[PDB]
Amino acid sequence: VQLQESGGGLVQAGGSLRLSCAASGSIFDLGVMGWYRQAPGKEREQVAGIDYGGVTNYADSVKGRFTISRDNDTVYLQMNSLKPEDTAVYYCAAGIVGDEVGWIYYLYWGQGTQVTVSSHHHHHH
Amino acid sequence: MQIFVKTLTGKTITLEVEPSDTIENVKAKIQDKEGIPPDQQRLIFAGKQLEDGRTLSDYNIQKESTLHLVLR
Amino acid sequence: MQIFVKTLTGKTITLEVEPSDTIENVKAKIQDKEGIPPDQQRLIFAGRQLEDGRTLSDYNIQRESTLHLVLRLRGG
Amino acid sequence: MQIFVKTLTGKTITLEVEPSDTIENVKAKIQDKEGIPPDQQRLIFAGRQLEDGRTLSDYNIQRESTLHLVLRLRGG
Ligand SMILES: [Zn+2]
């Protein structure tokens, strides 16, 4: 019973990637699913979230670029217009909310997938 | 937190609630704001009926979520 | 023996159980007390998911212990 | 006394604590063990969120008890 990310890799600036989060043990029925990332020297930070009703929410830094969605036992994160600042290990997590507002208690999380976004000079003048 | 309650006519009302507020407390707030008795109220989220004794966090209802009010 | 069950933010309820009771038996008692069907229940204790076939003694659940109940939430 | 901190992902932490250790003093040990900042830890015992300023004895946390560690992230 676990989550497991896939789809990361090295991509040029402005490129696209779709991360996949496969769940076993029906663990997405916790009700709240989210993607978060951590770069070296920085802290974990949620980028997108979706609940069992399908309602999504996003961090300001990824609005208009990232899209979180779900197909039953798989949660996706469509990443478009990727920037060097998006370089981090991306984790998917599932959990619940407690008595706090705006904070999520993730019970499960995967081992993460690495996303590296590099500037690549477009040499086609 | 602020949550929204959506009626069949399409009217959205905002309530100030707490994560551990019961559905019973939510129906009481709808009454104080719209004059609808909790006996006539049936609250829905993600297509599920919400039971009176449960809290909003029991159903993983986050901030700025929308419940659907169906009159009984 | 008497144990307790609560969600993270909800009221705590009391169960009369035996260490040999299975987790399926415990979930059925929660339905009798609270009307939550077993197929919508997740029980956690000591950071472990309580599997339906195991017993309470399999998780060292003893007198006055409190189980953490989590709802199974699905769309529609 | 020694207690355990367990994540549903499989991590088991063994900590030496005192019954008068505060919850935030325990989270400092977990950060040494796991590198998760205290603000991003949420400990659950007996179906209750362990809160800052309270001791382990305040929650009746005893020897060889197991705390449930979940990841607490700002979201929504
Ligand atoms: Zn060039």
Author numbering:
A (entry chain D): 4 to 128
B (entry chain A): 1 to 72
C (entry chain B), D (entry chain C): 1 to 76
Question: What sentences appear in the manuscript?
Answer:
Next, we combined the substitutions of the top two nanobodies (NbSL3.3Q). Strikingly, NbSL3.3Q demonstrated picomolar affinity to K48–K63-branched chains, which was ~2,500 times and ~10,000 times stronger binding compared to unbranched 48Ub3 and 63Ub3, respectively. Importantly, we did not detect any binding to unbranched K48-linked or K63-linked chains or to other branched chain types, demonstrating the specificity of the nanobody for branched K48–K63-linked Ub chains. To elucidate how the nanobody can selectively recognize K48–K63-branched Ub chains, we determined cocrystal structures of branched (Ub),63Ub in complex with the original NbSL3 and the affinity matured NbSL3.3Q, respectively. In both structures, the branched Ub chain envelopes the nanobody and takes on a completely different conformation from the free K48–K63-branched Ub3 crystal structure. Superposition of the two nanobody complex structures revealed an almost identical global binding mode, with a slight rotation of the three Ub moieties relative to the Nb in the matured nanobody structure (Cα root-mean-squared deviation (r.m.s.d.)(Nb) = 0.71 Å; Cα-r.m.s.d.(Ub3) = 1.19 Å). In both structures, the C-terminal residues V70, L71 and L73 of the two distal Ub moieties mediate hydrophobic interactions with the nanobody’s CDRs. CDR3 inserts itself within the three Ub moieties of the branched Ub3 and forms extensive contacts with the region near the K63 linkage (left). In addition, residues of the CDR1 and CDR2 loops form interactions with the region of the K48 linkage (right). To our surprise, of the four substitutions of NbSL3.3Q (R35V, F49Q, N58V and V103E) that enhance binding affinity by nearly three orders of magnitude, only V103E contributed to a novel interaction, while the other three substitutions facilitated tighter binding by reducing steric hinderance and alleviating unfavorable contacts present in the first-generation NbSL3 nanobody.
